[PDB]
Amino acid sequence: MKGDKKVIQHLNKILGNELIAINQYFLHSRMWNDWGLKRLGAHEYHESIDEMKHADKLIERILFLEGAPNLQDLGKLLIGENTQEMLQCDLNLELKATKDLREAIVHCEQVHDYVSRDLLKDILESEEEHIDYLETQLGLIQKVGLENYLQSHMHE
Amino acid sequence: MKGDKKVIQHLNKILGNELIAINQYFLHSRMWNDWGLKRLGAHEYHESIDEMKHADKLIERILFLEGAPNLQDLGKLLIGENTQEMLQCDLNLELKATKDLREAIVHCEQVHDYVSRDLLKDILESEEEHIDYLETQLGLIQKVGLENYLQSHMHE
Amino acid sequence: MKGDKKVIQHLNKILGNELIAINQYFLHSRMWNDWGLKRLGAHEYHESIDEMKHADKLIERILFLEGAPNLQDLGKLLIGENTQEMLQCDLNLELKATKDLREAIVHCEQVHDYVSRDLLKDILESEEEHIDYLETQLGLIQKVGLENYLQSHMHE
Amino acid sequence: MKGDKKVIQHLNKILGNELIAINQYFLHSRMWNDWGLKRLGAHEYHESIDEMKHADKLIERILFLEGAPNLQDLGKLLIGENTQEMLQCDLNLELKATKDLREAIVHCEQVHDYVSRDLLKDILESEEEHIDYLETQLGLIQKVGLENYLQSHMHE
Amino acid sequence: MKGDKKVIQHLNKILGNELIAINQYFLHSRMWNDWGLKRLGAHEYHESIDEMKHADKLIERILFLEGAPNLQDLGKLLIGENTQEMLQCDLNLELKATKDLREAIVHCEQVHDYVSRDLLKDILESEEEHIDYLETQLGLIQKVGLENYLQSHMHE
Amino acid sequence: MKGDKKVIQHLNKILGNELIAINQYFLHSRMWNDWGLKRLGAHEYHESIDEMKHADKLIERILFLEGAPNLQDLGKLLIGENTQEMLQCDLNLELKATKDLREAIVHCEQVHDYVSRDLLKDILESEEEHIDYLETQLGLIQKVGLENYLQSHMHE
Amino acid sequence: MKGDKKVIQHLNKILGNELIAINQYFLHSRMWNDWGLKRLGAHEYHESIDEMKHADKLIERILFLEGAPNLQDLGKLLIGENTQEMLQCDLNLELKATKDLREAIVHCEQVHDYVSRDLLKDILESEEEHIDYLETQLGLIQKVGLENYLQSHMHE
Ligand code: HEM
Ligand code: HEM
Ligand code: HEM
Ligand SMILES: [As]
Ligand SMILES: [Mg+2]
Ligand SMILES: [Mg+2]
Ligand SMILES: [Mg+2]
Ligand SMILES: [Mg+2]
Ligand SMILES: [Mg+2]
Ligand SMILES: [Mg+2]
Ligand SMILES: [Mg+2]
Ligand SMILES: [Mg+2]
Ligand SMILES: [Mg+2]
């Protein structure tokens, strides 16, 4: 089914966002696991997996719409050097991701690609939940203090 | 069954403290969830549900006694701005609530409405349990420090 | 995550409508139960629980958007005094609730708060279900007569 | 297998009658559901699924005999404005359908297409069961009065 | 609940398309079964059923909005003559159906019927899935050859 | 029960047709098994069994009507050289059987042997299902090519 | 544990080959699914996941050896335009990978990183397995013809 050319370019840019997210989160997860902070390791693993499945849905929809998914161009991964940095790196990436998603939905509505709008909304619902998770972890670092925070995240 | 007009007014006043407590404890619980203090939030939600169950039995009786239950005149919620303050706000609401129950129960006794008294004594017993919980948390903030106390209420 | 001010104002308004509905529907339920019309009491109870869950999710959404939920302001409860009027009251409240949900959806769309839009769309479909129930009961009173209608809501 | 061209004509006629029924009964079922007469909706809904199954078997048989099933020429639906009129419309349709069934069996017998005859006899048997139902609902409306009849069909 | 009269008109037009597809997919399913292409027959059978489900919802919504569902009017079936022709007819039909769905959605948004919108969107997502299936069968016919393609759909 | 002399003679004739088919189908089945076309072997085996069950019920009826079942005079088997001719041989035999079944039924009706007619109708229904099967296989050889057809019938 | 810095440069090279592999195989999978070659898509999906597991174990050995994993530099993805090109692209990549694996292993042996060698020997076995699969599919396309080969990979 021939899709709108700019819809597809939007979808490929979200995909590019999801592809940065997949790898940033995966490496952060394995750093935390590596330092002995398993609870964070595991939680960040699942965030990564989540973006993979978003990427999958985006690849699938591009192909249906007779476009060409772009998995070659990998943007800038924001890699913190401590827990507090890592969390804010992921939050910076999610805030870039959310306005880009918002850009695309406006366009889908213009051209009446409502199915693609809905796909993007469900993705946007999920990135807003990751923002909440992330912000809240920064808050808890202030309320309980970094050392307690890390302590609460050694084990599962 | 025609009731005592003043009992009904005591019952509506107790009902009135219940409705404040429902909205306050509920709002406090979501606040605590929102901040990542999910254990504090789950406890406070069950407190709110409890107050809902008292209101339901109060309403039921008022109607049996051919009064008119008052769900319209909501009073002032005591919303704290941090955890210590939120606990103390629940406490104050409860000290007020218990003084009004003791007064209701005196008048029930005087007019021989012994079933209404038994209801209020049950509720009173539940409010004193609540007070014990709140006083023990404040106690615990002091023994272990606010930071450790908040850490032990992040997860379940 | 900071959200649009007129959005949060819109949510606190929808929330205010829910709180009216919680109290009004709960009291009508206990009223129908008190009169021996257990089937109406059961159904009306479950409407009140529905409004409660909607209010929980608004409250959760307002806090994430860094707003301050308003459980303190409680509008005019519309209590009927017989079955026909309590139903007509519920309906009038629901029609006001859906005019406000539409306007608040319009606004979330303009400002690209698509997740808050989707939440409200969900609540709105719930309210339209409640409107269909309310309207059908009033038609059924006309079809089978009030006495048969009440007979059919005696037993659970 | 090449069948009698005229037998095929009858089968296609019978089919058309069943296509009217499907749509008539479905809409009637859904009108009744919409008025909160859930029991009449449910029964009428099964009458509709019933005619769909007859239609399936007529389409299969037409094809086997190398006919062309005609699902294009939808005849006149008989929609009522109230329960009693809806039932009387169902009764009118069914009585036309059995006159045609008997015509078609007469021709099947004549050309020795005994299988087709048997197919139409089994349909005829269902159609007579449906006549019996409709005549009995109309007779019960008289015996218990419309308001009781409809009360009895409010809930499943 | 009073619906916008031109929403109801669109709903009835979508209903009208659904009624064509029901009859057209069912007849195609029974042709394919009759030719021994039973995997094609079953899959086509379930596309028919799914359209019957969309019709049901559309009739249900129209009656709620005080509309009158049109099941008397049946547009032009596109009956193919062989497997390629039948699939292409189903695709042509689906392309008309998605166009009218977008048009109806634009209008629902305009008059703020966001629930009708959401329903129409769910259907559109289903219609688009049927389009992918059809385009995909047509493409496979080209990759594997018609003889093999049909071979692969003889047995269930 | 002394049955009609000519009814009994028709039943012996239909039995003779069954006896041919039994042997013809059993030999075709074992030829297809012997050539490694096991799915055709199995299917033809079950057609053989079915004609055996028909021959049983005819023998039981003939004996009840005080006749002599003729199992001795075996008509001409139509044995084919390749899959295509075997299916066509089966079909030719099935078309002679249905002709004799129709003439026997006509006679049963004139002399009012209605139970014999009902027996013969059930067999006719089975034979038409076999005619359907056989014609459909000859059509699929045309559609997928002989080599694919046979390929799809090597393994059970 | 301070590990050899050139080993760590190998591992990051092996890792960067896995990262090409993941994306390449995951796009081929989804192209195959989008063409209806669902058995090819599923098989290539699992090759993708397999490489993702390889990528995970290398990141972990690197972090433990005190190096910094590189997920930022995405190699050249070899994306075919038909099934046969797709498989040769996979094979092209896998021979580049095995070359790099053997280099890296010889170096591990020099410095006595026997444990990183054993991890590399395990990955090398996986890739040789995948080379066999890919060669065998190319050789099967010659033996059975492309139309049969794709036909056999339509369904799962
Ligand atoms: C750094 C690169 C990647 C790493 C390290 C990685 C790692 C993993 C791991 C460990 C799993 C779990 C496999 C299992 O044991 O079940 C997984 C699953 C998965 N991956 Fe990846 N992956 C990467 C890239 C990608 C990409 C680029 C995509 C899509 C474009 C993707 C899509 C998926 C999907 C759909 C799953 C299945 C998730 C589920 O349903 O559980 N991955 N990945
Ligand atoms: C801001 C106001 C309120 C909020 C947010 C609220 C919310 C809730 C929620 C989320 C539940 C759990 C329902 C479920 O998931 O099954 C609940 C249950 C319940 N509510 Fe409320 N509610 C409110 C006011 C009230 C009032 C005023 C009453 C009674 C007069 C009431 C009576 C009840 C009862 C009896 C239950 C069931 C408890 C049980 O037996 O498990 N609620 N409410
Ligand atoms: C007004 C148009 C129609 C409507 C609204 C409609 C609706 C429905 C619904 C809701 C179902 C049940 C689906 C499920 O939940 O599984 C159904 C089943 C079915 N329909 Fe229809 N349908 C229509 C036309 C037709 C026609 C024209 C035919 C055949 C020529 C047909 C054949 C069938 C069959 C065979 C079934 C399955 C019955 C069973 O459960 O065994 N339908 N229909
Ligand atoms: As083949
Ligand atoms: Mg496609
Ligand atoms: Mg009373
Ligand atoms: Mg104490
Ligand atoms: Mg927050
Ligand atoms: Mg045929
Ligand atoms: Mg209505
Ligand atoms: Mg005897
Ligand atoms: Mg270390
Ligand atoms: Mg080899």
Curated annotation (Swiss-Prot), chains A, B, C, D, E, F, G:
Q: Which residues bind Fe(2+) Fe2?
A: 51, 94, 127, 130
Q: Where does Fe(2+) Fe1 bind?
A: 18, 51, 54, 127
Quote the cofactor binding remark.
Answer: Each BfrB homodimer binds 1 heme group coordinated by an axial ligand from each subunit.
User: Key word Cytoplasm present in the record?
Assistant: yes
Keyword Ion transport assigned: yes
Per the record, the domain of life is Bacteria
What is the consequence of disrupting this locus?
A: No growth phenotype in iron-sufficient conditions, cells do not store detectable iron under any conditions tested, cells secrete less pyoverdin siderophore and deplete iron from the medium slowly. Very low amounts of FtnA-only BFR complexes accumulate in vivo at low O(2) levels.
- UniProt EC number: 1.16.3.1
SUPFAM superfamilies attached to this UniProt entry: Ferritin-like (SSF47240)
Query: What cofactor requirement does the entry state?
Result: heme b
Miscellaneous remark of the record = The unstable catalytic diiron-binding site within each subunit (Fe1 and Fe2, ferroxidase center) also serves as a pore for iron uptake; the ferroxidase center is labile. In the iron-loaded BRF crystal structure additional stably-bound iron ions are seen inside close to the ferroxidase pore. Mutagenesis of residues reveals other stably bound Fe cations in the interior of the BFR shell; they may represent a pathway followed by Fe(3+) to the central iron storage core.
- Give the protein's recorded name: Bacterioferritin BfrB
Gene encoding this polypeptide?
bfrB
